[PDB]
Ligand binder design. Structure first.
Ligand SMILES: CCCCCCCCCCCCCCCCCC(=O)OC[C@H](COP(=O)(O)OCCN)OC(=O)CCCCCCCCCCCCCCCCC
Ligand SMILES: CCCCCCCCCCCCCCCCCC(=O)OC[C@H](COP(=O)(O)OCCN)OC(=O)CCCCCCCCCCCCCCCCC
Ligand SMILES: CCCCCCCCCCCCCCCCCC(=O)OC[C@H](COP(=O)(O)OCCN)OC(=O)CCCCCCCCCCCCCCCCC
Ligand SMILES: CCCCCCCCCCCCCCCCCC(=O)OC[C@H](COP(=O)(O)OCCN)OC(=O)CCCCCCCCCCCCCCCCC
Ligand SMILES: CCCCCCCCCCCCCCCCCC(=O)OC[C@H](COP(=O)(O)OCCN)OC(=O)CCCCCCCCCCCCCCCCC
Ligand SMILES: CCCCCCCCCCCCCCCCCCCC
Ligand SMILES: CCCCCCCCCCCCCCCCCCCC
Ligand SMILES: CCCCCCCCCCCCCCCCCCCC
Ligand SMILES: CCCCCCCCCCCCCCCCCCCC
Lengths: 101, 162, 309, 480, 100
C-alpha cells in the first residue's frame, strides 16, 4: 500500500495500455488511410521443447533459492540435471534430434 | 486485486466457452491462449506469482505452441466435420450440457457453506516455492523428471514418422 | 487537487511513457542505421507516411484475425518485455518480483508472431518456412531461460534491480561468461536475426513469412524486430554488465553507452558473420547450448554454496 | 524434512529402479540391443527385490512428508516388482517378433514400476497423484506400442483420453479436499472436524471426484467400460502388466488412504463404495458371460475381482483383518492373472505384424500345448474361487471380512457373482480340452513358460497350504 | 478479501466447460483441447486452495499438474498424428472396431 508501489502499478498499467493502444492505433491508421484500387520432425522438436521447458521451470524454481536449499538441494538438482542430460544424450544418439539423417 | 480477479475470471470463462463451441482449430487455440492469459491474471491477483509466470511461460507458451504446431502440420481445411457441424445441433449438445450443469450445481453446492475468511492475496514468491520444491518435495521433483522422461519416450516412439 | 502522492503517480507515469517512446523511436533509428550502414529522420518520416498511405490489402483467402494479429505480437511482445529493464535508479517501469520471468513470458508469447503469420499467409511454402522458423526459435528458447538462470542463481532473486545491485562490484560477464554467450546466441535467435535470418533460404520448398505482409503490417514487423534488438541489448546490459553502474558518468549515460554498443555489435555481427545451415543451427542449439547452460548452472550453484561460510 | 542416510536405505527400491531407468537409457543410446537392455532391466528389478530385503532389515519410517515405508509398502512393492519382472519375461519373445525399436518397451516398464513403488510408499496426495501418473503415461506408450496395428492404436487412444480425464477428476477432487483441509497428508484429511461433523460437504465432494479417478484406474463400475477394449487391444505382456501391477499398486494406495484419513470412516463414503462394490461384482461377472475373446473375459473378470477387493476395503474401519484379506487376495490374484495372461502372451508370441491377426484360439490347446493348458485351467479354477487354489483363499478372506462386518448385501453379491464366474471360467477351462479342426525354440520363451508354471504351482500349493502366505501378509503390517 | 468460494466456483465452471467440450466434440483434437481445459481448471483450483491457506503446496501441486499436462499433451498429439497418418481422418467415432 506504499505510494511508490501504487505509483509503479499505475505506471505499468499505463505502459501496457499505451503500448497496445499505440500498436492498434498504428494499424488502424494504416488500414483507414490511403485510397484503394509436412514432416513430423517439427512435432518432435516442439515436443522436446515442451518437455525440456517444464524441466527448465524446475531449475528456474531451484535457481532463486539455492542458498536456502543448501548442499542437499544441490545434490537433488544434480540428480535432476543428470537425468535430463541422459535423456538429451538418448535423444541425440537415437537420431531424434538429427535434422538431416 | 479483486477487480483484476473478477475481470480475469470472467474473461477466462467466456474464452473457454468460445473454445468449446468453435469450429476453426486455430481460432479455438487462440481463445484458449486468451483463457490461459486470463487465468494467469487470476493467479497474479491471488499472489501466486510463480504460478502465473509458469502459466504464461509453459501452458500458454509451450503446450499451446505444440497444439498450434500439430494443427498447422495436419492442415485442417474442413475435413467433413466443419461442413457437418454436429456439436451445435441441439440433439447432440443438450444432453451433456444438462449433465455438466447438474455436476456444476452439485459441486457449487459443496463449495458453498464452507467456512471462508477470504484469500488474503499476500504474494507467495518463487523463492518459497523453490524452497518447498527442493525441501519436503524432493521425490516429487525427481519422479516428475522421470514422468516427463516417460512422456518424452512415449511421444517419440509413437509420433515419429519413419 | 494538489497532493504529492498524485504528483509522484503522474511523475512515474511520465517516466514510463518517456521510456516507451524512447524505445520505439530508438528502434526506428536502429532501422535507419542498419539501412544506411549496410535527413535520416526525415527519411523515416517519409517511410512512415508511405506505410500509412499505402493501401492495406488482406488476402481474400486468408483469415483476417490471425493475419492482423501476428504483427501486433511481433511488436508488442518484446516491446512489453522492455518494461522490467531498469535504465537508471528511479527510472524503471515496473519493479516486478518476477522480472526476468516476465521476459520469458514475453518471448514465449513472441513465438506466436511467426506461427500466426505463416498460418494466416495462405501459402504452403510460407507455412513450411514458418514451421522452420518456429522450430529454430523453440530450439533456442529451450536454453534461453537457463542461460539466464546462472545470473539468477548468483543474485538470489528474479528482480532486475537486485541483479544490478548484485553486480555492484564485479559485472556478471566475468563469472557468467557461458551464460552470457548462450544468452547472446539465444537472444539473436529469438529475434530471428542474423545469422538466424532466413531458415527458409535452405530450401525452395520454403518462403519467407514476411512475404504477403505489406504496408503498416510489414512496418510493424520491421519495427518490432528492431525494438526486439533494443530490449535484448538492454536486458543483456542489465543482466551481465552492471546495468547503469559506472565509475564517473551518470548512470543513464553508462546504460545508454552499453546498450548502444551492443546494438552496434549486433549490427556488425549481421554484417560480418556468415549464415550456417539449418540442421547445423538446430544441432548446435540442442547439442551444445542447452548442456552448456545446465553445466553452467550446476557449477554456479557449487561455487555459490562453497563461498558461503 | 530432510533425507537422512536411514531415509536413503529405506528409499532403496525407488533409487535402484530410477538408476536402472538411467542405465538402460544410456545403454540404448550407446547401441540399440534387445537382449542386453532386457537383461539390464530385469537385473534392476531383481536388485530392487533384494533392496526390499535390505529395506526390511531397516525400520518403518516416514521418508518425506510424502513417503512412508513400512511392511505394507514392502509387500506391495514386491508385488509390483514381481509383476514387472513377469511382464519383461513375457515381453521378450513378443518383442523378438517385433520389427521396430524394442527397448523403449523396457524403459516404459521400468518407469511404470517406479510409479508402482511410489504408490506403494505414498503417504501424501502429492505422491498418490504422481504415482498414478507414473503408472499411466508409460502405459500409454505400452498399450499402443504396436501402433501400426489398428486395435493397439485404438486401445492407446481410448486409454490415454480416459486416463487424462480421470486424472483431471482426481486432481480437482484433491484440490477440493485441500481447500477444505489445509494439509495434503493422508492422516490430515478430516482432522479439523469434530462432534460428528466428519461429513463436510466439500471434503465429501473432493473425495467423490477422487473416487471417480481411482475407480477409473481400478475398473470399478461405472468407470469400467474402457477395460475390455484396452485389455484386448493392448499387447499381451502389456495386458499382463495392466491387469496385475497397475491395479495392485492403485488399490494399495487406496487402502492406505482410506486407512489413514479420518474421513475414511464416513458413512456416506462407505455406502457409496458399497454400491460401487455390489455393482462391480454383479456387472463384471454378468458381462463376462458371453465372451469368446479371452482378453475381454479377463477384463470383466478384473472388474469383478476388484469389486471383491473393494468389499474387503469397506470393512477396513470396522473389522481388523481387512488389510490381511486384501494382501492375501492380491497375492493370489497377482499369481492367477500372471499365469493366465502369460499363457495368452506366450501363445501370441512372437509378434506376427500389424496386419496378421492375434487371436488366442484356446479351443483344443491341450493337444499341442499340454503344460500351457494345465496352467491356464489352474488359473481359470483359481479365478473362479475353486478350493485347492489360492483364489479360493482370497475369496474365503473376503467372505470372512464381509461376515464380520455384517455386509450381507456384499456377501450375497460375492456368492451370486461367484456362481456366474463358475459358468464362464469353467467354459474356458473345458474348452481347453475339446478338439479343434486347425489353428519358441529359445530360452526366453522357456523362461516365460517357467514363470507361468511356477505361478500354477504357487496357486495350487498355497491353495492347499495357505499358512506361509498368511504368515507373510500378517507380518507386513503398516503403521497403526 | 477474495472469498475462497469464488475461486473454487470459477475453477469448477472451467472444469465443467472443459468436460462438456470433451464430450460433445467429435474431433480428437478438440477432445485433447477440452482435456487441457479440465486439467488447467484443476490446477487453478489447487492454486486457489494454496493461496487461501497461505502455503506453497498449492503452487507445487500446480507444477506437478502442468508437468502431467505437458507430458499427456505430447502423448495425445503423437497419438493424434499417428491416427491422422494411418486413417487420414480425425473422427473419434470411426476408431471403434473393438466392442462388446
Ligand atoms: C475493463 C473492461 C474489459 C476490457 C477488455 C479486457 C482488458 C483486460 C482486463 C483484465 C486485465 C486487467 C484487470 C485490471 C488490473 C488492474 C491492476 C490491479 O488491479 O492491480 C491490483 C493488483 C496489484 O498487486 P497488489 O500489490 O496485490 O495490489 C494491492 C496493493 N498492494 O494486481 C495484481 O495483483 C495482478 C493484476 C492482474 C494481473 C496482470 C494482468 C493480467 C492480464 C490478463 C489479460 C488476459 C487477456 C485479455 C484479452 C482482452 C480482449 C478479449
Ligand atoms: C489485443 C489485446 C490482448 C490482451 C493484451 C493485454 C491485456 C491487459 C492489458 C491491461 C493491463 C492492465 C494493468 C495490469 C496490472 C499491472 C500491475 C501488476 O500486474 O501489478 C501486480 C504485480 C506486482 O508485483 P510486484 O510489484 O513485484 O509486487 C508488489 C507486491 N504486492 O505484477 C504482476 O503480477 C506482473 C505480472 C503480470 C503482467 C501482465 C502483462 C500483460 C500480459 C499480456 C501480454 C500480451 C502480449 C501480446 C498478445 C499475446 C497473444 C494474444
Ligand atoms: C513363498 C510363498 C509365496 C509368497 C509370495 C510373496 C509375493 C510378494 C514378494 C515380496 C514380499 C515382500 C514382503 C515383505 C514383508 C516384510 C514385513 C516386515 O516388517 O518384515 C520385517 C522383517 C525383518 O524383521 P524385523 O526384525 O521386524 O525387522 C525390523 C526391525 N528393525 O523383514 C523381512 O522379513 C524382509 C523380507 C524380505 C523379502 C525379500 C523378497 C525377495 C523376493 C522373493 C520372491 C519369491 C518368489 C515369488 C514369485 C515367484 C515367481 C512367480
Ligand atoms: C444368495 C446366498 C447368500 C445370501 C446373502 C448372505 C446371507 C445373508 C444373511 C442375512 C442376515 C441378516 C441379519 C440381521 C440382523 C443383523 C444385525 C444383528 O443384530 O445381528 C445379530 C448378531 C449380531 O449381534 P450381536 O450382539 O453380536 O449378537 C451375537 C449373537 N447373535 O448377528 C450375528 O451374530 C451373526 C448373524 C448371522 C446371520 C446369518 C448368516 C448366515 C446366513 C446363511 C445363508 C443365508 C440364509 C439362508 C439362505 C437363504 C436363501 C439363499
Ligand atoms: C429354492 C430357493 C432356495 C434355494 C436356493 C439355492 C441357490 C443355490 C443353488 C441353486 C443354483 C441354481 C442355478 C441354476 C442355473 C444353473 C446354471 C445353468 O443352467 O447353466 C447351464 C447354462 C448353459 O446352457 P445353455 O442354456 O445351453 O447355454 C446358453 C448359452 N450358450 O448356463 C446358462 O445359460 C448361463 C448360466 C449363468 C450363470 C449361472 C446362473 C447363476 C444364477 C444365480 C446363482 C445364485 C442363485 C441364488 C438363488 C436364486 C433363487 C433361487
Ligand atoms: C547441509 C549439508 C549437507 C551435506 C551432505 C549432502 C549429501 C548427503 C545427503 C544426500 C541426499 C540425497 C537425496 C537424493 C534423493 C534422490 C531421489 C531420486 C528418486 C528417483
Ligand atoms: C537504448 C536506450 C533506451 C533507453 C530507454 C529509456 C530512456 C529514459 C531516459 C531517462 C533520462 C534521464 C535519466 C535520469 C537522470 C540521469 C541522467 C542524466 C543525463 C541524461
Ligand atoms: C491338480 C490340478 C487340478 C486342475 C488342473 C487340471 C489339469 C491336469 C493336467 C491335465 C489333464 C488332461 C486331461 C485330458 C483328458 C482328455 C481326454 C480325451 C479323450 C477322452
Ligand atoms: C442381479 C444380482 C442380484 C444379487 C443380489 C444378492 C442379494 C443377497 C441377499 C442380501 C440380503 C440382505 C439382508 C439384509 C438384512 C439386514 C437386517 C438389518 C437389521 C438391523
Amino acid at each position: 500500500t506504499s505510494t511508490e508501489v501504487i505509483a509503479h502499478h499505475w505506471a505499468f498499467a499505463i505502459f501496457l495500455i499505451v503500448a497496445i493502444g499505440l500498436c492498434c492505433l498504428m494499424l488502424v491508421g494504416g488500414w483507414f488511410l490511403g485510397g484503394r484500387a509436412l514432416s513430423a520432425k517439427f512435432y518432435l522438436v516442439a515436443m522436446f521443447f515442451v518437455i525440456f521447458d517444464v524441466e527448465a521451470l524446475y531449475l528456474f524454481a531451484w535457481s532463486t533459492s539455492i542458498r536456502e536449499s543448501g548442499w542437499v538441494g544441490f545434490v537433488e538438482a544434480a540428480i535432476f540435471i543428470f537425468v535430463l542430460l541422459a535423456g538429451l544424450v538418448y535423444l541425440v544418439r537415437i537420431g531424434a534430434l538429427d535434422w538431416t539423417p | 486485486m479483486e477487480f483484476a480477479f473478477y475481470i480475469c475470471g470472467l474473461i477466462a470463462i467466456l474464452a473457454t466457452l468460445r473454445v468449446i463451441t468453435h469450429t476453426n482449430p486455430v481460432h479455438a487455440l487462440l481463445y484458449l491462449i486468451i483463457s490461459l492469459l486470463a487465468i494467469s491474471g487470476v493467479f497474479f491477483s491471488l499472489g501466486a506469482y510463480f504460478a502465473g509466470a509458469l502459466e504464461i511461460i509453459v501452458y500458454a507458451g509451450a503446450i499451446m505452441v505444440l497444439f498450434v504446431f500439430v494443427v498447422m502440420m495436419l492442415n485442417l481445411g474442413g475435413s467433413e466435420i466443419e461442413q457437418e457441424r454436429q456439436w451445435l445441433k441441439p440433439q447432440v449438445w443438450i444432453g451433456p450440457a444438462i449433465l455438466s450443469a447438474i455436476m456444476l450445481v452439485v459441486i457449487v453446492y459443496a463449495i458453498l457453506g464452507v467456512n471462508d475468511q477470504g484469500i488474503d492475496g499476500t504474494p507467495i514468491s518463487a523463492k518459497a516455492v523453490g524452497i518447498t520444491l527442493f525441501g519436503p518435495y524432493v521425490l516429487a521433483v525427481e519422479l516428475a523428471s522421470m514422468l516427463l522422461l516417460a512422456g518424452l519416450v512415449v511421444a517419440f516412439h509413437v509420433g515419429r514418422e519413419e | 487537487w494538489i497532493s504529492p502522492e498524485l504528483i509522484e503517480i503522474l511523475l512515474t507515469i511520465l517516466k514510463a511513457v518517456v521510456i516507451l517512446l524512447v524505445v520505439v523511436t530508438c528502434g526506428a533509428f536502429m532501422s535507419f542505421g542498419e539501412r544506411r550502414l549496410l535527413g535520416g529522420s526525415l527519411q523515416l518520416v517519409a517511410d512512415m507516411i508511405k506505410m500509412f498511405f499505402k493501401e492495406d490489402w488482406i488476402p481474400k483467402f486468408s483469415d483476417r484475425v490471425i493475419f492482423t494479429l501476428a504483427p501486433m505480437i511481433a511488436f508488442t511482445s518484446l516491446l512489453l518485455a522492455f518494461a522490467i529493464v531498469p535504465v537508471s535508479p528511479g527510472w524503471v517501469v515496473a519493479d516486478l518480483n518476477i522480472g526476468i520471468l516476465f521476459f520469458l513470458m514475453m518471448a514465449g508469447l513472441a513465438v506466436y508472431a511467426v506461427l500466426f503469420a505463416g498460418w494466416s499467409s495462405n501459402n504452403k511454402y510460407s507455412l513450411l518456412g514458418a514451421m522452420r522458423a518456429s522450430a529454430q526459435t523453440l530450439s533456442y528458447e529451450v536454453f534461453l531461460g537457463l542461460s539466464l538462470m546462472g545470473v539468477v542463481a548468483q543474485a538470489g532473486s528474479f528482480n532486475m534491480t537486485d541483479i544490478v545491485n548484485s553486480q555492484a562490484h564485479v559485472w556478471n560477464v566475468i563469472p557468467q561468461f557461458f551464460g552470457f554467450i548462450t544468452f547472446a546466441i539465444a537472444g539473436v535467435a529469438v529475434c530471428h536475426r542474423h545469422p538466424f535470418d532466413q531458415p527458409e533460404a535452405e530450401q525452395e520448398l520454403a518462403d519467407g513469412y514476411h512475404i504477403e505482409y505489406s504496408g503498416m503490417k510489414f512496418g510493424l514487423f520491421f519495427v518490432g524486430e528492431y525494438i526486439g534488438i533494443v530490449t535484448i541489448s538492454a536486458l543483456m546490459v542489465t543482466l551481465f554488465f552492471g546495468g547503469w553502474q559506472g565509475p564517473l558518468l551518470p548512470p543513464f549515460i553508462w546504460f545508454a553507452l552499453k546498450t548502444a554498443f551492443f546494438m552496434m555489435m549486433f549490427i556488425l555481427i549481421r554484417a560480418s558473420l556468415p549464415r550456417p545451415r539449418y540442421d547445423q543451427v538446430m544441432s548446435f542449439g540442442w547439442k551444445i547450448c542447452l548442456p552448456l547452460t545446465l553445466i553452467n548452472l550446476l557449477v554456479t550453484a557449487a561455487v555459490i554454496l562453497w563461498q558461503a561460510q | 524434512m530432510t533425507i537422512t542416510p536411514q531415509n536413503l536405505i529405506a528409499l532403496l527400491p525407488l533409487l535402484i529402479v530410477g538408476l536402472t531407468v538411467v542405465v538402460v537409457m544410456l545403454s540404448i543410446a550407446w547401441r540399440r540391443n534387445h537382449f542386453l537392455n532386457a537383461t539390464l532391466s530385469v537385473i534392476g528389478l531383481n536388485a530392487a527385490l533384494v533392496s526390499l530385503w535390505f529395506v526390511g532389515q531397516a525400520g518403518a519410517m516416514d521418508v518425506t512428508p510424502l513417503m512412508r515405508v513400512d511392511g505394507f509398502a514392502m509387500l506391495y512393492t514386491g508385488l509390483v516388482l514381481l509383476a514387472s519382472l513377469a511382464t519383461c519375461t513375457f515381453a521378450y519373445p513378443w518383442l523378438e517378433g517385433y520389427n521396430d525399436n524394442k527397448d523403449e518397451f523396457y524403459l516404459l516398464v521400468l518407469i511404470a514400476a517406479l510409479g508402482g513403488i511410489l504408490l506403494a510408499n505414498a503417504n501424501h496426495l502429492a505422491s498418490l497423484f504422481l504415482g498414478i501418473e507414473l503408472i499411466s503415461l508409460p502405459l500409454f506408450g505400452l498399450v499402443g506400442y504396436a501402433f501400426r496395428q489398428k486395435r493397439s492404436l485404438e486401445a492407446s487412444i481410448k486409454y490415454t483420453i480416459l486416463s487424462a480425464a480421470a486424472s483431471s477428476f482426481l486432481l480437482f477432487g484433491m484440490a477440493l479436499v485441500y481447500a477444505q483441509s489445509g494439509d495434503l497428508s493422508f492422516v490430515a484429511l478430516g482432522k479439523n472436524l469434530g462432534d460428528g461433523m466428519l461429513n463436510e460437504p466439500l471434503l465429501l465432494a473432493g473425495f467423490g471426484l477422487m473416487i471417480v479417478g481411482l475407480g477409473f484406474k481400478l475398473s470399478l463400475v461405472p468407470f469400467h467400460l474402457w477395460t475390455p477394449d484396452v485389455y484386448q487391444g493392448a499387447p499381451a505382456p502389456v495386458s499382463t502388466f495392466l491387469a496385475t501391477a497397475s491395479k495392485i499398486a492403485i488399490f494399495g494406495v487406496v487402502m492406505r488412504l482410506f486407512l489413514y484419513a479420518p474421513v475414511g470412516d464416513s458413512e456416506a463414503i462407505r455406502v457409496v463404495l458399497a454400491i460401487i462394490a455390489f455393482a462391480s461384482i454383479i456387472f463384471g461377472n454378468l458381462m463376462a458371460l458371453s465372451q469368446t475373446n479371452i482378453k475381454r473375459l479377463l477384463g470383466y473378470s478384473s472388474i469383478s475381482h476388484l469389486g471383491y477387493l473393494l468389499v474387503a476395503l469397506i470393512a477396513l474401519q470396522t473389522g481388523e483383518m481387512s488389510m490381511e484379506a486384501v494382501g492375501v487376495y492380491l497375492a493370489g490374484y497377482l499369481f492367477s492373472s500372471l499365469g493366465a495372461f502369460g499363457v495368452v502372451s506366450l501363445m501370441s508370441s512372437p509378434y506376427r505384424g500389424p496386419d496378421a491377426d492375434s487371436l488366442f484360439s484356446y479351443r483344443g490347446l491341450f493337444w499341442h500345448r499340454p503344460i500351457l493348458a494345465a496352467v491356464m485351467t489352474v488359473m481359470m479354477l483359481s479365478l473362479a474361487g475353486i478350493p485347492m487354489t489360492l483364489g479360493f483363499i482370497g475369496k474365503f478372506y473376503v467372505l470372512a471380512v464381509g461376515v464380520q462386518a455384517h455386509l450381507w448385501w456384499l456377501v450375497g453379491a460375492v456368492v451370486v457373482g461367484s456362481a456366474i464366474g463358475l459358468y464362464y471360467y469353467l467354459r474356458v477351462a473345458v474348452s481347453l480340452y475339446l478338439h479343434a479342426p486347425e489353428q519358441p525354440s529359445n530360452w526366453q520363451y522357456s523362461a516365460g513358460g517357467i514363470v507361468v508354471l511356477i505361478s500354477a504351482l504357487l496357486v495350487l500349493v498355497l491353495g492347499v497350504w495357505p499358512q506361509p502366505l498368511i504368515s507373510i501378509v500378517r507380518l507386513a503390517m503398516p503403521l497403526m | 478479501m477474495i472469498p475462497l468460494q469464488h475461486g473454487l466456483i470459477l475453477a469448477a465452471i472451467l472444469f465443467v466447460l472443459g468436460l462438456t467440450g470433451l464430450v460433445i466434440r467429435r474431433n480428437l483434437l478438440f477432445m485433447l483441447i477440452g482435456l487441457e481445459i479440465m486439467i488447467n481448471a484443476s490446477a487453478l483450483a489447487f492454486v486457489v486452495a494454496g493461496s487461501y491457506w497461505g502455503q506453497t503446496d498449492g503452487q507445487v501441486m500446480y507444477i506437478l499438474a502442468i508437468s502431467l499436462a505437458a507430458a499427456e499433451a505430447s502423448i495425445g498429439l503423437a497419438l493424434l498424428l499417428q491416427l491422422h497418418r494411418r486413417r487420414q481422418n480425425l473422427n473419434i467415432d470411426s476408431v471403434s472396431e473393438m466392442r462388446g
